[PDB]
Amino acid sequence: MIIPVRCFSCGKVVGDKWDAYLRLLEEGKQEGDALDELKLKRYCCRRMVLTHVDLIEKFLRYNPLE
Amino acid sequence: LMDDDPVLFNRQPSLHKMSMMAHRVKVMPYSTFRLNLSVTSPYNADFDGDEMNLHVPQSEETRAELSQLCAVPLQIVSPQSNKPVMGIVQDTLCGVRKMTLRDTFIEYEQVMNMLFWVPSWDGVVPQPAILKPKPLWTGKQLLSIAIPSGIHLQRTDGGNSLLSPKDNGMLIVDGKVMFGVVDKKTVGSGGGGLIHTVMREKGPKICAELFGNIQKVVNYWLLHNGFSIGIGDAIADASTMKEITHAISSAKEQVQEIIYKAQHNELELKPGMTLRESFEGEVSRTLNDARDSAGRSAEMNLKDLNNVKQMVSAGSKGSFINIAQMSACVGQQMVEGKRIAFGFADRSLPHFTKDDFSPESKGFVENSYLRGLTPQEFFFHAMAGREGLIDTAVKTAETGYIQRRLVKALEDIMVHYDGTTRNSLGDIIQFLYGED
């Protein structure tokens, strides 16, 4: 839905890295290199960001009803 | 409802009298029931969705009936096959096999914790098997702590001597294990094992407490030892792979020779059997023995540290066929007792040519699960599994009908005070029950 604040397994804060990750993917860096640069070293933290599906973009498309 | 109240506990279907047993209550949080794991065998239960019913007796007479007739300790031995039905299962087994190996040693601090974990421990620390240069206890000592005193057990496995080079067989003297790995043959539900012996000599209460003592000791030791399984436990080295593939090629050549003999009118028939049925029986024999030989090679390749081998050797899960199918060859698929029929015109699948009797055409799967099945082999194995699912889904109704009819036929039959076995009309069925 929206990026989780913490890593499930260990609890590192990954919620402040989604925008940097998107900008890194924009400038051509492949996913492993982007995750390396954000200093996500444990594969739990890495799969937190690598497997996220951002559905809030899809939910926001339905007009506010008030 | 409070602690130690007797309640009747039940899982459907109730196929035998040990599907409904009386338990003592212990109140706990969460919304799920809790069962000791050794009683999951008589219920035929597991923990992947199952539900069970609890009935509360509403008077003192029904409380006494439950506690004195239906209680779990009283049902350990069954009259169906005069053997125990509750045994040691899963980790407690695998763990006791690993713990009672000859080269398993324990230091003083883990020994102290394990001793304190035994509810019936009498507070006396046994002398260590090794006193110098460092006190070490063996797992056999710690397991012998669990067994009550006054127990003698003796088993011979393949004519072993009293010095047991393989550490097989079993000798128990005054409740202490002298030699022998403790596995399914000793703490399983088979007859003549340790559970049956303790039941017959000490009674149902001490036998019930034996399950708990052994479970606690082995679970602590396994918690601090560990046991796992990985993809590497199903992988055989190159030489065993060469042996397996050579055996499979030899069997394919044998099948091709049988095919040539049948086509040139040289096959030797069997009594009560057609030339085609003889041909099919001979081919099935050949391919089954091929799979068995490849499996034997794969099993021989496995080290004593292989985790699959440890689970099989403990007898807690899996068998030789599982190792064979995982590592060497899935083998031949059968649909309704026969090989894969020619569902298309003169072929099994439209990727074969007509009248091709080779093992690959009619459902022999040459690969293992590790290697992966081809699409044809995948489809044939799916057909066989579908046959199994249909059988499982469809036969249970006939079986339930048969058991209902048997119960209605025999429901009115009771042993009377004069020893006779009579029905509700008073007519004699047997002058003495069981003739003994």
């Binding site: 397994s9 260990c10 609890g11 492949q30 996913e31 492993g32 290199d33 982007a34 995750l35 390396d36 444990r42 594969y43 739990c44 890495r46 799969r47 690598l50 | 009747l8 109730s14 035998h16 009298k17 409904m20 969460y30 919304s31 799920t32 923990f47 992947d48 969705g49 539900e51 009935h55 007796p57 509403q58 007479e61 029904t62 439950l66 007739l69 239906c70 899963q90 980790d91 695998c94 918690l223 601090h224 030892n225 560990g226 046991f227 796992s228 399984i229 990985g230 993809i231 199903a234 699959v308 689970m311 899960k317 899996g318 599982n322 199918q325 699960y369 590790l370 992966g372 209902r404 119960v407």
Partner: protein, 196 residues
């Protein structure tokens, strides 16, 4: 995704769970005794592929009937600085001592199924009865009772518990009182209890 269903038996906190040398702790610990007799090798292969994909930052391809092999995946995994078969040295959470055996460790895709215990837990002491039979109604939502069917009766008969059976079928269910004529044996007796 390989037929490996199960329910949660217990939950442990972060500090109680076993950890690897990198401080990674598992979300989930399943039992080894579900692999051998079920022969779900794809589960282990997929755990290995998922580990490699998460380490190298891509998604593993697990399409059936492709030319991928376990050996290539293990070569990649060892090149990434991990034991090539997915084993890791883990430590005991309670004591910090190493485990004597190494543990197959990695990510696996799990599913949250619709069956929750809180939608199934039901108890009934006394409650609504049926109009016709005066027996407990049927249904968890209606606060019903559980059926003590025929095979349950067979098991109680095998146990020889006659009193328990009578109490299940009478005082825990539709017990009633009727007056019969001692001469004609029909329940046609008109009774006025307040007038005796």
């Amino acid at each position: 995704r390989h037929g490996q269903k199960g329910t949660i038996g217990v939950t442990y906190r972060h500090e109680d769970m076993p950890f690897s040398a990198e401080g990674i702790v598992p979300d989930l610990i399943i039992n080894p005794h579900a692999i051998p007799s079920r022969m779900t090798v794809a589960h282990l292969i997929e755990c290995l592929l998922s580990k490699v994909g998460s380490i190298r930052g891509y998604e593993g391809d697990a399409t059936p009937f492709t030319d991928l092999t376990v050996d290539a995946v293990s070569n990649l995994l060892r090149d990434n600085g991990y034991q090539s078969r997915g084993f890791e040295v883990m430590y005991n959470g309670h004591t910090g001592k190493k485990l004597m055996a190494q543990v197959f460790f990695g990510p696996t895709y799990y599913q949250r199924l619709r069956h929750m215990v809180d939608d199934k837990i039901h108890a009934r002491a006394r409650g609504p009865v049926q109009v016709l039979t005066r027996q407990p109604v049927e249904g968890r939502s209606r606060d019903g009772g559980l059926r003590f069917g025929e095979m349950e009766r067979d098991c109680m008969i095998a146990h020889g518990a006659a009193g328990f059976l009578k109490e299940r079928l009478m005082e825990a269910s539709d017990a009633f009182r009727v007056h019969v004529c001692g001469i004609c044996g029909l329940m046609s007796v008109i009774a006025n209890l307040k007038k005796n």
